[PDB]
Amino acid sequence: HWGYGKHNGPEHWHKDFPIAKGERQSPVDIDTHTAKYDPSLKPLSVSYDQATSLRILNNGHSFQVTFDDSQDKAVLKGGPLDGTYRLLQFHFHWGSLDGQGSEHTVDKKKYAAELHLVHWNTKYGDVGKAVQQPDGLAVLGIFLKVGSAKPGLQKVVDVLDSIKTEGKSADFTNFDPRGLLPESLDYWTYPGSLTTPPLAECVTWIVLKEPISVSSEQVLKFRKLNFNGEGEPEELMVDNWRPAQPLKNRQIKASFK
Ligand SMILES: Cc1cc(C)cc(NC(=O)Nc2ccc(S(N)(=O)=O)cc2)c1
Numbered sequence: 655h656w657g658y659g660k661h662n663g664p665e666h667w668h669k670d671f672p673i674a675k676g677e678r679q680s681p682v683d684i685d686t687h688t689a690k691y692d693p694s695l696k697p698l699s700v701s702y703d704q705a706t707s708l709r710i711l712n713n714g715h716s717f718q719v720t721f722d723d724s725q726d727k728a729v730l731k732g733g734p735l736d737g738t739y740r741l742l743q744f745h746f747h748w749g750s751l752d753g754q755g756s757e758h759t760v761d762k763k764k765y766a767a768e769l770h771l772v773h774w775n776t777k778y779g780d781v782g783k784a785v786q787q788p789d790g791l792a793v794l795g796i797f798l799k800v801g802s803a804k805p806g807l808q809k810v811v812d813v814l815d816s817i818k819t820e821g822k823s824a825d826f827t828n829f830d831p832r833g834l835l836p837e838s839l840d841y842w843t844y845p846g847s848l849t850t851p852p853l854a855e856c857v858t859w860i861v862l863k864e865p866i867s868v869s870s871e872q873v874l875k876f877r878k879l880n881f882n883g884e885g886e887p888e889e890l891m892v893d894n895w896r897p898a899q900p901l902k903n904r905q906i907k908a909s910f911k
């Protein structure tokens with residue numbers, strides 16, 4: 655099955671998922687001098703006050719924190735978006751070294767990691783339907799650089815020992831995702847795809863300008879997760895990122911100047 659290794663990684667994915675070579679694939683490089691300020695872009699509306707976290711899971715490709723999305727509790731609106739998108743899950747992509755790990759890049763610069771807050775358009779009723787639509791998902795992408803610790807990340811870091819291997823999960827209630835956001839909601843936006851198989855072209859990408867800082871100890875604990883399951887030889891979960899894909903016939907827009 656697909657993964658991030660030499661024999662099953664991003665260069666192989668197109669054989670099972672031919673849309674890998676499609677017209678709106680993610681991630682991309684954000685060339686900051688070529689992105690155009692769009693004064694008609696509204697401010698983002700991130701309404702996470704009522705967010706209800708559920709469980710944290712190692713799925714063998716990342717770890718994911720899930721949310722109750724059966725009501726409008728944690729929603730993303732505004733920006734380039736029409737309508738209301740419910741928070742389903744967040745997860746990360748990260749590197750083996752601090753100079754790599756993000757999926758999007760900024761003027762070819764790679765960050766140590768990238769947070770994806772995944773939301774789906776409620777007019778499609780459920781996330782499975784939404785993934786089949788060009789405006790079905792909105793993913794808020796946030797870069798991580800290594801420096802000062804991010805206090806709002808620490809409860810995530812604390813529990814990773816209990817989900818070390820593929821297939822493990824733990825009860826992760828009462829987590830506040832607002833503690834993962836930077837100060838500014840300035841953003842770039844473009845139409846794209848899921849960055850993991852099936853690579854569906856269903857995502858409005860919203861990538862924040864301002865990275866969050868995390869400590870070396872925090873990201874080191876990401877790197878101690880395992881791709882393997884329990885009772886298998888250890889393979890460290892690192893470098894779970896897809897590289898930048900051709901921009902093709904797309905323009906990246908900026909909410910700021
Ligand atoms: C928790 C959950 C439940 C269900 C029914 C579906 C999903 N699927 C999902 O979140 N897919 C997805 C894959 C890749 C990205 S990325 N890496 O482009 O942000 C986002 C969502 C996730």
Ligand SMILES: [Zn+2]
Nearest residue numbers: 745747770849
């Ligand atoms: Zn992702």
